[PDB]
Amino acid sequence: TVFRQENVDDYYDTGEELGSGVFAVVKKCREKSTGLQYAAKFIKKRRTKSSRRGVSREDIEREVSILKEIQHPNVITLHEVYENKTDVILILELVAGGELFDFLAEKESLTEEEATEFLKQILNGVYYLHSLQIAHFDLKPENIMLLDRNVPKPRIKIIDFGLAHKIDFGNEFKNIFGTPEFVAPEIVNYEPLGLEADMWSIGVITYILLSGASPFLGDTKQETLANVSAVNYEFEDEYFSNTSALAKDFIRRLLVKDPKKRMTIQDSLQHPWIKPPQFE
Ligand SMILES: Nc1ncnc2c1ncn2[C@@H]1O[C@H](COP(=O)(O)OP(=O)(O)O)[C@@H](O)[C@H]1O
Numbered sequence: 001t002v003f004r005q006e007n008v009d010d011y012y013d014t015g016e017e018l019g020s021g022v023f024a025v026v027k028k029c030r031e032k033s034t035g036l037q038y039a040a041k042f043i044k045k046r047r048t049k050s051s052r053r054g055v056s057r058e059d060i061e062r063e064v065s066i067l068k069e070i071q072h073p074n075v076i077t078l079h080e081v082y083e084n085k086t087d088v089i090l091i092l093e094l095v096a097g098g099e100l101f102d103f104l105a106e107k108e109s110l111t112e113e114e115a116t117e118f119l120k121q122i123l124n125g126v127y128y129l130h131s132l133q134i135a136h137f138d139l140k141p142e143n144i145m146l147l148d149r150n151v152p153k154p155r156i157k158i159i160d161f162g163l164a165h166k167i168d169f170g171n172e173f174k175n176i177f178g179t180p181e182f183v184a185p186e187i188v189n190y191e192p193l194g195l196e197a198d199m200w201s202i203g204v205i206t207y208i209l210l211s212g213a214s215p216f217l218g219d220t221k222q223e224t225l226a227n228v229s230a231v232n233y234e235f236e237d238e239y240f241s242n243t244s245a246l247a248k249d250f251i252r253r254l255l256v257k258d259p260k261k262r263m264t265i266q267d268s269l270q271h272p273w274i275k276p277p278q279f280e
């Protein structure tokens with residue numbers, strides 16, 4: 001489908017850059033007619049059919065369709081879409097407190113309570129998405145933004161729907177691959193993928209939250225990928241010796257090779273701890 005083709009600069013003023021991707025750049029912006037602030041994501045379009053620069057129209061349309069469906073406190077929303085010959089421009093809800101990735105860098109490691117306060121929001125957002133048969137396929141700390149990083153209990157939003165897909169048959173087989181440290185073994189092995197791939201990523205994120213260390217990270221992307229397929233991780237005593245056994249149990253039930261045997265989003269919410277690009 002087609003998007004608004006008026007000059008986006010007629011309607012918005014842009015400011016600081018918020019983030020950068022392979023073929024996307026995200027800039028703070030202000031809508032002229034309301035004075036409200038947004039994040040404008042400029043996605044470079046493919047210049048030819050066969051090209052490897054830019055994002056295919058099919059992929060952009062899929063990201064926009066998915067964004068248009070979502071309205072939940074723990075996920076980003078889509079305000080408007082514009083386009084011109086070079087880019088598609090998504091006007092997204094602004095999340096102004098930075099990435100969970102940078103918050104973690106400025107903290108080195110969280111307590112179980114700080115970890116579970118983030119985790120419960122992430123699980124709620126993922127529950128919403130999975131309820132809608134949307135697999136995110138790129139869950140990692142850089143794709144989890146804080147509304148405000150200077151409150152004791154920050155609120156979060158899941159961002160970056162660039163790899164997300166509807167799963168109509170319980171699995172899809174269209175060649176998806178995110179960041180080696182966070183991808184599930186079925187991604188590594190090029191097998192049919194479903195909602196369970198997100199649950200593995202959640203296990204990786206949880207491990208990092210608790211320890212400040214990445215459970216499968218090797219010295220090269222290929223070594224990480226090998227570690228993932230083999231489920232080559234362990235709870236280092238130096239990091240986890242004073243972490244509860246229930247926290248370890250939650251992680252152990254997510255970092256499971258067979259997606260059929262991995263906890264679902266609904267199981268994760270009822271778990272006792274909780275219940276109240278690939279190539280070098
Ligand atoms: N809605 C937003 N609010 C604030 N920052 C954002 C927002 N969306 C993206 N960013 C920043 O821009 C970076 C790149 O955007 P992203 O959607 O992750 O694109 P891609 O993975 O295609 O590069 C993010 O990691 C984040 O730092």
Ligand SMILES: [Mg+2]
Pocket residue numbers: 021142143160
């Ligand atoms: Mg991203």
